Amino acid sequence: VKTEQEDVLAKELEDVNKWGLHVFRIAELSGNRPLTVIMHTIFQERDLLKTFKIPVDTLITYLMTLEDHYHADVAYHNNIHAADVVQSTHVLLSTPALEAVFTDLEILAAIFASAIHDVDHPGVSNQFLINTNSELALMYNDSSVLENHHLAVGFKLLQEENCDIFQNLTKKQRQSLRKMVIDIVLATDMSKHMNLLADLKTMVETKKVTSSGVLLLDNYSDRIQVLQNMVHCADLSNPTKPLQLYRQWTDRIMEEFFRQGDRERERGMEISPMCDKHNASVEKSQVGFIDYIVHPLWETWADLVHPDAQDILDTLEDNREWYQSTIP
Amino acid sequence: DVLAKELEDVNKWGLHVFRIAELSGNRPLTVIMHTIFQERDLLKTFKIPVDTLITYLMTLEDHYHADVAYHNNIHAADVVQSTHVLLSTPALEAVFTDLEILAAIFASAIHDVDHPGVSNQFLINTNSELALMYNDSSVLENHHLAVGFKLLQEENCDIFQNLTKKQRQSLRKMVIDIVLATDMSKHMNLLADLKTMVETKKVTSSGVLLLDNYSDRIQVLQNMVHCADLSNPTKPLQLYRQWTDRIMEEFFRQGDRERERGMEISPMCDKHNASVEKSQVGFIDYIVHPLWETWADLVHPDAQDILDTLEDNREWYQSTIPQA
Ligand SMILES: COc1ccc(/C=N/OCC(=O)N2C[C@@H](C)O[C@@H](C)C2)cc1OC1CCCC1
Ligand SMILES: COc1ccc(/C=N/OCC(=O)N2C[C@@H](C)O[C@@H](C)C2)cc1OC1CCCC1
Ligand SMILES: [Mg+2]
Ligand SMILES: [Mg+2]
Ligand SMILES: [Mg+2]
Ligand SMILES: [Zn+2]
Ligand SMILES: [Zn+2]
């Protein structure tokens, strides 16, 4: 355990290797430190401290700082979402079809990218930031504004006192991990979804597997592509989770969206799609989200790692039925 | 006075820009931008208060670094003026809207603002704050854009104040697209696509190019400003020599910092082991000529005088290099 608690957190953390970890429970039991606790657990499980000579106190110090820079008053894009994506990536990394495909450095990059990928999220969209002429959009030229910011912050925090968890990587290692983490977080920009999926389908069509069905990736292009899509899937994994988890994620994203719509309405701006609390169809919207975004993505991932992801797909379909059933 | 006579050549390749800098009190960017805006009737068209223009331009010019030998206000003024000339090439007559013309010229003016005199790779390799900010991706070019637009916020500096919301939005997208294309790491991809565009190009009866969508139009503007940025070797020898002096001074200062830091010194940045002639001939052969012969193809025969000068300058510099 990497944070002061008491306790029974251990019984819940037994599911850290399973889809459907109750991450909200973890948040409660850990004093709202789900990202620190789950990251610390994963790093120990994967022996990453020993491999990369990461001092444990340095890891905890960085995680505490990183966690503090997720906004507590943001309903969805907060430290629990970061913890969720981290843990979800951790599960996907261990899928049998990917056995021994990735290096420990690649595993570290995926997990680190997952942890920082929404840090300092303000609870409003890229388009909102652009439309309101935010300093952030001015900084990043309207291009992957948030995602560029999340990386800048995640890396800059390494420079805080006793926070450089990469201090004992080689120069080449840090350079490679940096490139991979950047490639991965920039791929979480939803504006890149259709292209990313399109390329993922292409890769699937011409995939190569050993006898036991293990994927053969040849080069960096292959490997980074699978990692990009993996963390993208993890980011978009809410509707594939056990329904009670999914239901809370839906509650939180709508709360966050509605708060942006309130900011838009207050400034006399056109209210963004699905951000109008006065005219929302939350259930119908989740069904469309699954039909046009989440299922097409996950159907393709499932193909890539066939048959590893079948139950994830089945759960997605069951959860689609639930929101369908509850349209008024 | 004398300045006025020099600015008469503003519509011509090979404007004595260094003379203009001396004569204006080191305000080439302000003088040349003002002149071009007046010539193209840009103040009237976009209702730009002339006082606002000068205030912006003076502040913009102030944010080019004095102590940087190549990437300064004179380079900026040169690229602006060169783009201004290319815009009027016969093959592009009446093709671009006034907004697109404004975007191309504004982009040129800001395209290197607050340049520190060291390369992207240097900034990446030294773990600079700029590289941390921009995730190692077009580090300087993103920065130029951010600063160029940020200055519009200064008091009485918003030259786009009377653009419609939509015009401002379009201008902003176009300028970003253009300045990002000045990143040399994108050169080969730009050039490969330009060659493919040339292959399938369409012209009117009078012979002007037909660019019927934003993609084709911005592509031409991107490559035009990139050519302007890479136009030094196409200029009269007296001007080209001066640009070569300055880029080498700048590079060698980077090399100096690399050596002090114990770093491996970048190509062409080692003052002790560098050859001007050899370096310019390679620069022409492998970057500038491939690009300009493609531009010349696009607008043939509009740019043949430019291409001729470049090929003469190449022949000139290779002539003192011993060869079999
Ligand atoms: C549990 O559900 C979700 C989980 C995660 C996400 C993340 N989505 O990424 C997009 C985004 O962030 N935008 C998109 C833009 C149109 O609107 C901008 C305010 C921001 C969305 C979820 O629900 C959808 C479906 C209906 C409500 C949203
Ligand atoms: C008058 O000459 C020039 C004018 C302009 C330029 C602009 N070059 O753009 C690229 C660049 O800045 N760098 C930085 C450094 C790492 O090296 C490059 C591979 C990439 C170059 C000129 O001459 C060459 C030949 C020798 C000096 C350079
Ligand atoms: Mg259990
Ligand atoms: Mg995000
Ligand atoms: Mg530049
Ligand atoms: Zn996310
Ligand atoms: Zn330049």
Side-chain angles (χ1 to χ4, degrees), chain A residues 7-328, chain B:
Chain A
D7 178 281
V8 327
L9 182 50
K11 183 167 185 57
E12 294 293 325
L13 287 177
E14 288 183 329
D15 291 328
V16 62
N17 70 333
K18 298 186 231 315
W19 214 245
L21 170 73
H22 203 305
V23 60
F24 296 110
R25 197 115 56 201
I26 302 292
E28 296 163 356
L29 294 167
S30 69
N32 212 26
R33 288 290 175 177
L35 183 60
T36 296
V37 173
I38 289 177
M39 282 281 281
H40 171 261
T41 290
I42 285 163
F43 271 63
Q44 299 281 3
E45 279 267 303
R46 290 186 174 278
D47 214 22
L48 286 171
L49 296 86
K50 203 175 259 181
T51 296
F52 290 114
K53 288 177 187 299
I54 314 174
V56 62
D57 59 305
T58 307
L59 174 63
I60 291 179
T61 300
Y62 176 80
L63 290 167
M64 294 287 284
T65 315
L66 177 65
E67 191 142 31
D68 290 343
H69 276 91
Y70 281 90
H71 301 198
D73 60 330
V74 170
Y76 180 95
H77 290 107
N78 56 45
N79 60 326
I80 313 175
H81 168 67
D84 183 40
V85 166
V86 161
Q87 187 262 333
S88 297
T89 292
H90 165 68
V91 170
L92 297 178
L93 277 167
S94 290
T95 201
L98 288 178
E99 211 101 74
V101 169
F102 299 107
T103 62
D104 295 322
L105 190 65
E106 286 163 347
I107 290 166
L108 177 65
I111 291 175
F112 183 73
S114 297
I116 66 172
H117 88 276
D118 276 332
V119 60
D120 200 39
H121 201 293
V124 293
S125 69
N126 276 330
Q127 193 63 49
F128 178 93
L129 291 173
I130 292 172
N131 290 342
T132 55
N133 319 290
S134 62
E135 291 294 316
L136 263 185
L138 191 66
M139 179 82 81
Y140 289 115
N141 298 308
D142 298 349
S143 174
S144 292
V145 178
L146 287 160
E147 292 78 15
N148 272 291
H149 181 59
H150 303 314
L151 288 154
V153 172
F155 279 111
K156 172 59 182 176
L157 290 178
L158 295 168
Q159 302 175 10
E160 286 202 358
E161 179 179 345
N162 198 33
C163 279
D164 187 2
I165 57 162
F166 301 138
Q167 69 186 247
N168 287 324
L169 277 45
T170 65
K171 206 202 283 187
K172 173 168 179 173
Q173 278 179 323
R174 199 193 279 254
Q175 289 172 353
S176 180
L177 171 136
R178 176 165 164 82
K179 176 52 159 298
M180 292 191 282
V181 166
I182 283 168
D183 283 349
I184 289 161
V185 179
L186 287 177
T188 62
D189 184 346
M190 273 307 303
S191 81
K192 289 188 157 185
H193 169 77
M194 291 299 170
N195 276 350
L196 198 72
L197 176 62
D199 292 328
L200 176 57
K201 288 179 164 299
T202 299
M203 152 165 299
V204 162
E205 296 176 350
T206 66
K207 77 169 179 168
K208 289 162 47 201
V209 300
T210 70
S211 317
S212 48
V214 176
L215 283 164
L216 298 163
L217 311 179
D218 311 280
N219 43 69
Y220 178 84
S221 181
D222 284 349
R223 290 194 299 272
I224 196 59
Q225 178 169 7
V226 167
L227 290 177
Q228 281 169 324
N229 274 276
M230 183 185 291
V231 175
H232 183 48
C233 284
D235 200 26
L236 296 181
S237 56
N238 291 164
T240 74
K241 294 295 171 72
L243 183 57
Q244 285 317 102
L245 290 177
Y246 184 17
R247 290 174 69 189
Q248 164 137 216
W249 289 121
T250 293
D251 286 342
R252 288 173 174 269
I253 198 69
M254 299 306 310
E255 174 179 353
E256 178 167 321
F257 276 11
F258 290 160
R259 280 172 187 165
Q260 179 183 318
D262 293 346
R263 295 177 54 179
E264 290 170 337
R265 186 186 303 104
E266 182 64 42
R267 298 172 60 142
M269 304 164 61
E270 174 181 282
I271 299 180
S272 293
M274 299 168 307
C275 297
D276 187 358
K277 64 195 177 178
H278 287 281
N279 303 283
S281 46
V282 171
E283 296 84 12
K284 188 173 66 177
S285 283
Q286 282 307 313
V287 173
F289 178 48
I290 294 171
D291 291 345
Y292 293 99
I293 294 176
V294 185
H295 187 266
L297 178 56
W298 274 100
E299 173 176 57
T300 306
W301 180 265
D303 276 349
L304 180 71
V305 299
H306 179 78
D308 296 357
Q310 189 56 49
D311 188 65
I312 286 172
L313 219 45
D314 293 332
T315 306
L316 181 54
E317 286 174 21
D318 291 348
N319 290 351
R320 188 208 185 261
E321 298 178 358
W322 169 261
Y323 276 106
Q324 257 294 138
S325 291
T326 56
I327 304 182
Chain B
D1 35 317
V2 176
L3 178 56
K5 122 175 181 301
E6 287 297 336
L7 292 177
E8 287 175 13
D9 300 340
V10 76
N11 287 8
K12 299 162 206 163
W13 211 248
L15 176 90
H16 307 140
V17 62
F18 293 107
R19 197 173 298 169
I20 295 181
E22 298 174 330
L23 290 160
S24 61
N26 196 39
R27 289 289 178 165
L29 184 52
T30 299
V31 292
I32 288 165
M33 280 286 279
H34 174 77
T35 292
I36 289 175
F37 271 66
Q38 285 296 4
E39 268 260 42
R40 298 190 163 267
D41 210 36
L42 288 177
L43 297 111
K44 180 177 306 175
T45 300
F46 294 103
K47 309 179 179 299
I48 305 170
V50 48
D51 55 322
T52 309
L53 180 60
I54 277 62
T55 293
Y56 175 80
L57 296 166
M58 287 281 286
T59 316
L60 176 66
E61 191 147 25
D62 280 344
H63 282 73
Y64 280 88
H65 292 199
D67 46 82
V68 166
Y70 182 88
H71 289 100
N72 51 47
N73 57 328
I74 314 176
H75 175 60
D78 181 40
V79 170
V80 168
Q81 190 261 341
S82 302
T83 291
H84 164 73
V85 172
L86 296 177
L87 275 170
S88 292
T89 191
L92 291 173
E93 181 193 22
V95 162
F96 296 112
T97 65
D98 288 313
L99 190 67
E100 285 161 344
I101 285 167
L102 174 66
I105 293 173
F106 180 76
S108 297
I110 69 167
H111 87 279
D112 274 332
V113 62
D114 194 44
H115 198 298
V118 293
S119 63
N120 278 335
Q121 197 59 224
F122 180 96
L123 293 166
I124 290 163
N125 289 345
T126 57
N127 303 111
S128 71
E129 289 304 296
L130 275 177
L132 186 68
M133 183 70 76
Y134 286 115
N135 300 306
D136 297 344
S137 171
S138 304
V139 170
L140 285 168
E141 291 75 17
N142 275 293
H143 181 59
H144 303 317
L145 279 166
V147 167
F149 285 105
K150 174 68 174 184
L151 289 178
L152 297 167
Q153 285 176 13
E154 291 304 276
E155 184 183 0
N156 195 36
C157 279
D158 191 14
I159 63 177
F160 302 134
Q161 62 183 64
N162 291 319
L163 272 54
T164 78
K165 176 179 294 293
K166 185 176 184 176
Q167 285 178 327
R168 227 215 155 90
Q169 293 181 352
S170 184
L171 181 126
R172 183 175 156 72
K173 180 178 78 173
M174 289 195 287
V175 166
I176 288 164
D177 284 350
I178 291 176
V179 177
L180 288 180
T182 64
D183 182 345
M184 284 295 310
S185 76
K186 297 157 167 168
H187 167 73
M188 285 305 164
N189 280 346
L190 273 187
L191 182 58
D193 292 341
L194 178 61
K195 286 176 167 303
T196 299
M197 150 168 291
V198 167
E199 173 182 11
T200 59
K201 74 181 179 130
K202 309 171 74 170
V203 288
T204 71
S205 290
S206 51
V208 313
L209 283 159
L210 299 161
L211 315 175
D212 57 357
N213 39 10
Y214 176 87
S215 54
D216 268 26
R217 304 171 67 89
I218 198 59
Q219 172 172 25
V220 168
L221 291 167
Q222 282 174 319
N223 278 286
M224 169 185 303
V225 172
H226 182 54
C227 287
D229 194 30
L230 293 173
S231 67
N232 299 160
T234 74
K235 296 296 171 65
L237 211 46
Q238 304 277 5
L239 285 164
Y240 182 22
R241 223 195 329 276
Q242 285 183 78
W243 292 118
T244 295
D245 285 353
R246 292 170 171 273
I247 194 72
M248 293 303 291
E249 178 171 341
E250 184 165 313
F251 280 12
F252 286 161
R253 285 165 146 155
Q254 169 173 326
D256 282 1
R257 292 162 63 177
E258 290 175 337
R259 194 181 33 246
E260 300 172 0
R261 279 179 169 266
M263 300 169 56
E264 170 165 335
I265 313 165
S266 312
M268 294 160 170
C269 295
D270 188 356
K271 61 186 169 193
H272 301 299
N273 321 282
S275 175
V276 164
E277 304 75 12
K278 301 197 68 69
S279 282
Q280 286 302 312
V281 168
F283 179 50
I284 294 173
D285 285 355
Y286 300 117
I287 297 175
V288 181
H289 188 271
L291 173 61
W292 274 99
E293 78 173 336
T294 300
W295 182 264
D297 208 346
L298 180 66
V299 302
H300 177 86
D302 293 354
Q304 190 65 54
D305 291 333
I306 299 180
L307 192 57
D308 282 341
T309 296
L310 174 61
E311 279 166 12
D312 291 346
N313 290 347
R314 191 271 180 198
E315 171 72 4
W316 176 258
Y317 273 137
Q318 63 83 46
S319 63
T320 58
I321 303 168
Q323 305 180 19

